Amino acid sequence: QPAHLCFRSFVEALKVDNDLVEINTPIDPNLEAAAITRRVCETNDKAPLFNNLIGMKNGLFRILGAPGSLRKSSADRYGRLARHLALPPTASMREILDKMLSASDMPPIPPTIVPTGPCKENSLDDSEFDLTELPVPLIHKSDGGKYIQTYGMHIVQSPDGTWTNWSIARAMVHDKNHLTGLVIPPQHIWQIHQMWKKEGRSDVPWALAFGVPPAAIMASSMPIPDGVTEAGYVGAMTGSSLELVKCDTNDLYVPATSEIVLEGTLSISETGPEGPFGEMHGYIFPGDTHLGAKYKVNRITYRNNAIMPMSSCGRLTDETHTMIGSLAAAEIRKLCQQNDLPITDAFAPFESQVTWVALRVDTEKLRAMKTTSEGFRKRVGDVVFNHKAGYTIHRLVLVGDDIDVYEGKDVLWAFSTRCRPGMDETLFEDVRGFPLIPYMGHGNGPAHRGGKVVSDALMPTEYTTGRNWEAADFNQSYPEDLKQKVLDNWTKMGFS
Amino acid sequence: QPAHLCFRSFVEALKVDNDLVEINTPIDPNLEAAAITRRVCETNDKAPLFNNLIGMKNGLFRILGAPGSLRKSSADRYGRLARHLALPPTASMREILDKMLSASDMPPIPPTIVPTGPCKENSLDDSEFDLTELPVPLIHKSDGGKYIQTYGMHIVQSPDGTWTNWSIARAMVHDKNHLTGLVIPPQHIWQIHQMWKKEGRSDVPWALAFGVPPAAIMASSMPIPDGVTEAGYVGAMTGSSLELVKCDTNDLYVPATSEIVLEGTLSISETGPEGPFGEMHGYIFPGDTHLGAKYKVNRITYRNNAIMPMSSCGRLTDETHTMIGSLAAAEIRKLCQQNDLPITDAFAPFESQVTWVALRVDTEKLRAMKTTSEGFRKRVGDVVFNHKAGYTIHRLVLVGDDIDVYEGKDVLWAFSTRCRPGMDETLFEDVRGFPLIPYMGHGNGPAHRGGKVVSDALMPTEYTTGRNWEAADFNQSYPEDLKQKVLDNWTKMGFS
Numbered sequence: 001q002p003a004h005l006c007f008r009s010f011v012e013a014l015k016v017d018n019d020l021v022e023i024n025t026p027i028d029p030n031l032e033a034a035a036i037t038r039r040v041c042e043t044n045d046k047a048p049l050f051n052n053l054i055g056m057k058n059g060l061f062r063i064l065g066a067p068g069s070l071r072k073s074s075a076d077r078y079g080r081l082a083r084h085l086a087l088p089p090t091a092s093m094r095e096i097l098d099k100m101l102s103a104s105d106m107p108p109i110p111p112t113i114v115p116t117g118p119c120k121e122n123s124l125d126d127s128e129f130d131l132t133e134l135p136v137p138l139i140h141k142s143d144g145g146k147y148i149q150t151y152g153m154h155i156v157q158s159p160d161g162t163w164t165n166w167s168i169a170r171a172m173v174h175d176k177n178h179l180t181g182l183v184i185p186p187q188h189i190w191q192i193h194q195m196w197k198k199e200g201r202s203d204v205p206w207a208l209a210f211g212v213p214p215a216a217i218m219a220s221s222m223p224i225p226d227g228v229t230e231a232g233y234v235g236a237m238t239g240s241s242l243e244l245v246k247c248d249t250n251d252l253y254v255p256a257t258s259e260i261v262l263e264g265t266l267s268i269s270e271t272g273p274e275g276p277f278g279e280m281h282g283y284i285f286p287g288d289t290h291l292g293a294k295y296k297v298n299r300i301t302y303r304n305n306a307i308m309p310m311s312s313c314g315r316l317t318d319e320t321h322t323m324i325g326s327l328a329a330a331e332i333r334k335l336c337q338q339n340d341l342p343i344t345d346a347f348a349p350f351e352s353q354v355t356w357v358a359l360r361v362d363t364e365k366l367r368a369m370k371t372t373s374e375g376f377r378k379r380v381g382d383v384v385f386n387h388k389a390g391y392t393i394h395r396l397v398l399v400g401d402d403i404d405v406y407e408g409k410d411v412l413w414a415f416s417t418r419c420r421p422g423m424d425e426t427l428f429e430d431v432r433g434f435p436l437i438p439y440m441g442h443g444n445g446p447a448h449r450g451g452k453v454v455s456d457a458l459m460p461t462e463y464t465t466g467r468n469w470e471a472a473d474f475n476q477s478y479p480e481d482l483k484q485k486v487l488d489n490w491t492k493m494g495f496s
Numbered sequence: 497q498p499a500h501l502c503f504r505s506f507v508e509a510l511k512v513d514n515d516l517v518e519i520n521t522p523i524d525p526n527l528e529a530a531a532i533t534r535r536v537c538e539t540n541d542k543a544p545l546f547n548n549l550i551g552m553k554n555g556l557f558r559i560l561g562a563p564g565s566l567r568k569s570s571a572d573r574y575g576r577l578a579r580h581l582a583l584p585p586t587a588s589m590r591e592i593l594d595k596m597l598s599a600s601d602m603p604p605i606p607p608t609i610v611p612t613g614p615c616k617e618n619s620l621d622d623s624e625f626d627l628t629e630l631p632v633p634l635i636h637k638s639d640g641g642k643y644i645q646t647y648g649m650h651i652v653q654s655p656d657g658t659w660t661n662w663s664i665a666r667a668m669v670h671d672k673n674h675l676t677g678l679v680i681p682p683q684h685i686w687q688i689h690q691m692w693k694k695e696g697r698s699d700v701p702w703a704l705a706f707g708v709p710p711a712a713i714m715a716s717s718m719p720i721p722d723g724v725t726e727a728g729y730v731g732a733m734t735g736s737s738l739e740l741v742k743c744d745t746n747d748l749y750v751p752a753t754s755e756i757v758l759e760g761t762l763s764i765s766e767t768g769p770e771g772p773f774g775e776m777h778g779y780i781f782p783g784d785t786h787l788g789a790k791y792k793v794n795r796i797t798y799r800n801n802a803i804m805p806m807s808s809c810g811r812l813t814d815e816t817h818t819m820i821g822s823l824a825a826a827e828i829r830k831l832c833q834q835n836d837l838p839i840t841d842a843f844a845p846f847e848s849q850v851t852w853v854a855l856r857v858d859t860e861k862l863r864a865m866k867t868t869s870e871g872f873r874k875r876v877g878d879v880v881f882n883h884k885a886g887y888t889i890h891r892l893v894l895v896g897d898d899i900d901v902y903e904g905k906d907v908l909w910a911f912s913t914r915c916r917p918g919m920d921e922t923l924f925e926d927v928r929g930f931p932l933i934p935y936m937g938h939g940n941g942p943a944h945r946g947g948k949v950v951s952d953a954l955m956p957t958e959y960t961t962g963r964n965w966e967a968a969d970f971n972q973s974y975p976e977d978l979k980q981k982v983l984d985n986w987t988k989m990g991f992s
């Protein structure tokens with residue numbers, strides 16, 4: 001089965017790519033696996049596969065770190081992401097994001113139910129497992145718990161059965177048969193929880209599947225629209241109906257080749273201590289413990305030789321940057337276009353810790369709008385910051401046709417030189433804010449509201465008559481014939 | 497004579513360092529030399545020495561490009577700058593800026609007058625030279641003239657003789673015996689021009705010396721205080737009195753080993769067409785011609801085999817970044833400390849196109865101030881943005897003790913995660929602005945006023961009780977013994 005549709009096949013693809021290091025000597029899930037993984041992410045090294053984890057009992061479990069992190073080379077920088085999607089490993093970010101958006105104007109391809117799959121090879125009932133006795137990693141030294149859940153798929157369904165949501169949200173072990181985790185607005189796991197709580201009859205039937213089909217974990221990380229079942233969107237994106245098997249203890253369906261499946265309920269009443277956690281912006285606030293949602297685990301099923309994927313998240317560059325940022329930016333691009341805004345491309349620069357999105361403007365179309373910076377800034381911010389796709393993003397940077405938004409250097413150059421602080425910006429204080437950003441949840445202002453800005457790095461004539469500068473760079477400040485002569489004579493003259 | 501005190505010796509030092517490429521085949525000063533230089537700066541290659549310039553007549557002239565640009569290696573990244581100052585080529589930016597600040601609390605060492613020097617080897621009077629017949633470079637394809645002056649030293653003196661200023665300011669050829677250039681407030685060449693214009697008696701006696709002592713061109717690029725004679729400050733910084741020779745046609749003094757000396761006057765009445773020019777922020781606005789100051793050239797003296805230094809300025813990274821930004825930041829650091837602000841370090845991040853300065857705060861001292869973000873932001877901005885040293889800088893970023901301001905990645909991380917847009921910022925609209933920044937001179941607002949901001953990336957507890965986070969990075973989120981094990985076993989496990 002293909003790498004994009006089967007996690008076990010994806011691990012083999014990383015091996016064949018020489019993009020894996022198999023560590024067959026004992027590694028401690030208490031910090032060591034995540035430390036190795038963290039160093040990998042900070043240095044764009046090969047993904048580590050920990051085949052010998054201290055505390056692995058009855059096939060639970062191996063760990064793959066850095067499943068969606070970057071490669072060292074520019075030529076296949078995004079190759080792990082490309083391996084999630086059946087794309088060539090040399091795929092550009094534009095090509096990855098266009099693949100992730102391709103299902104947005106296709107009919108869903110609903111999933112196919114099969115009677116069994118590898119995820120049923122082993123099972124443990126409510127008398128046979130203890131989540132405190134599994135080799136769950138301690139990812140950061142001050143974490144408030146062992147974070148079993150960084151790269152699995154929560155599966156919850158609306159009470160009426162019409163929407164089944166797949167998403168990533170963190171969770172840690174609370175006791176032998178419970179997790180706690182973040183369930184916050186406006187996330188779809190929270191929207192669905194709210195539906196069950198207002199019905200008031202029962203806890204939310206739930207499953208958490210780890211090592212799901214790579215194309216499914218990408219959609220799990222993407223803010224596709226409210227009410228859209230991720231299974232059908234991944235089906236349309238891949239052109240293949242996903243095979244799912246029923247859970248043993250509830251009527252939800254999990255990917256048939258899931259490495260590890262937890263079945264149980266998400267409580268509509270109970271909470272427990274959650275966090276702190278070393279998070280995507282690069283911080284942990286030690287002893288910052290809050291109350292989180294509480295999950296009850298009734299059953300575990302798993303593959304022989306099961307592999308748990310793990311994100312050791314924090315400072316650049318890991319899955320919280322390459323997937324959270326980039327996939328939000330893709331949905332923002334589409335959202336702007338659907339609102340008749342002349343946006344061609346969007347990307348969350350890694351240098352902004354994926355708190356900015358750079359929006360490339362088709363300035364020919366902008367000129368035909370006969371508008372102004374203040375007006376256009378206001379319109380773009382109202383569209384993006386009042387939508388769920390804009391949740392994690394606190395600064396939008398508008399740039400003209402000459403900027404490649406996928407090149408952080410060029411975004412920073414445009415931002416720094418074409419946007420006058422204050423005058424070329426509009427602040428948004430009455431929009432939902434992302435509290436995980438330290439200046440929000442641990443800052444001077446409301447944790448959940450405001451602190452957003454649209455920064456216009458379009459120059460004045462981009463709205464009227466056209467770009468009125470040339471860059472003072474090799475590309476733009478010299479004629480073609482000269483540039484080519486210089487390049488052709490470069491090593492002859494003595495340069496490197 | 498030592499490399500820091502003699503430009504010819506500095507060129508030999510770059511050769512011996514394997515940091516030079518001598519191009520002995522003919523190179524066109526019309527764009528080709530500057531294109532090669534531009535590519536060098538964009539790729540941190542070796543400095544080009546053009547020994548065979550098309551149009552060189554009677555020893556005028558060779559060109560050295562990229563005299564203060566970066567080297568490829570991290571280990572000697574700033575080695576060219578270190579060669580300006582007698583520092584080891586492995587010098588850090590902190591060490592370079594501390595050397596440039598060292599004269600600020602020393603008695604000046606006045607210059608020594610000598611009767612002759614290499615700069616008198618050749619001369620051309622008012623009947624013998626034609627500036628349009630020299631191989632003056634066209635640096636960018638849309639420049640409004642041939643910019644003879646990018647890395648020479650203007651020498652002007654107050655009418656009362658008590659202050660002699662050395663500075664870099666651009667100038668281009670106007671006709672056979674005149675230049676035009678930018679003379680703008682608050683620059684010292686402009687302050688002195690104003691003194692002569694209010695006296696009203698005569699044009700300003702002037703000289704422009706190219707290929708001056710490297711330590712002297714660094715001070716020329718630094719905003720040392722009003723009324724301070726750069727010669728005495730370089731003397732104190734180097735511990736050696738600079739040897740100067742009198743001009744032939746006026747009573748100014750030039751460095752004895754100057755490669756090329758123009759003598760004449762800066763007009764208190766005349767102007768001429770100046771620019772456009774490909775400038776430090778990375779832009780040219782073609783046909784943007786303004787009126788500039790007008791210089792009359794009465795005499796040229798020069799060394800046998802004279803070498804003209806040239807900055808091919810624009811996008812990263814050249815002398816307009818490494819010297820303008822860094823030397824402003826050094827003077828800002830000192831200015832803050834003199835105003836009892838607890839600043840330890842300052843640097844202008846290259847990623848900001850040197851329009852930001854990051855200020856590292858001693859947060860133990862900050863806590864003893866018992867102050868707030870708004871108050872402290874306001875105080876720092878009032879100090880820096882109402883002083884000449886803050887002129888080119890439009891954003892200040894305040895960061896705590898954990899940030900290395902010399903590491904752009906860490907500044908961007910702190911800025912992006914610890915400064916809430918709007919709430920944690922103070923805008924300054926009633927301060928002098930830098931019109932060369934495109935969002936100023938070609939923007940939506942007043943070209944010369946406002947558009948400045950203090951961005952506070954100090955977290956709330958940095959003002960009260962102390963940092964209350966750990967980074968989610970390899971360094972901070974794992975214990976020492978574990979980190980060292982991981983590093984010691986890194987190649988054994990299979991990593992690069």
Ligand SMILES: Cc1cc2nc3c(=O)[nH]c(=O)nc-3n(C[C@H](O)[C@H](O)[C@H](O)COP(=O)(O)O)c2cc1C
Nearest residue numbers: 167168169170187188189220221222223311319323
């Ligand atoms: C490694 C990783 C960790 C994540 N952690 C969280 C988290 O703890 N909580 C959260 O709400 N979203 C988290 N996300 C992001 C969500 O997956 C993303 O916002 C997605 O759009 C949610 O799905 P939904 O649109 O169906 O709600 C994470 C994503 C990744 C790649």
Ligand SMILES: Cc1cc2nc3c(=O)[nH]c(=O)nc-3n(C[C@H](O)[C@H](O)[C@H](O)COP(=O)(O)O)c2cc1C
Nearest residue numbers: 663664665666683684685716717718719807815819
């Ligand atoms: C390559 C280069 C080009 C420069 N061009 C200019 C310029 O055209 N005009 C200007 O006023 N300053 C220019 N500067 C900056 C000044 O040298 C700097 O602001 C210095 O502080 C001026 O000296 P002063 O403090 O004695 O006025 C340049 C510096 C460098 C390194």
Ligand SMILES: O=C(O)c1ccc2ccccc2c1
Nearest residue numbers: 170182277279280324392436
């Ligand atoms: O509970 C977090 O660490 C976290 C991380 C990333 C997140 C991304 C989008 C929404 C919520 C998020 C929460």
Ligand SMILES: O=C(O)c1ccc2ccccc2c1
Nearest residue numbers: 666678773775776820888932
């Ligand atoms: O006339 C410019 O291109 C220019 C370049 C750098 C400058 C630096 C400080 C002050 C003025 C400046 C002017």
Ligand SMILES: [K+]
Nearest residue numbers: 166219220222
């Ligand atoms: K999703």
Ligand SMILES: [K+]
Nearest residue numbers: 418424456458
């Ligand atoms: K703008």
Ligand SMILES: [K+]
Nearest residue numbers: 662715716718
């Ligand atoms: K100076």
Ligand SMILES: [K+]
Nearest residue numbers: 914920952954
């Ligand atoms: K702050």
Ligand SMILES: [Mn+2]
Nearest residue numbers: 165166188224
């Ligand atoms: Mn969803």
Ligand SMILES: [Mn+2]
Nearest residue numbers: 661662684720
């Ligand atoms: Mn001066």
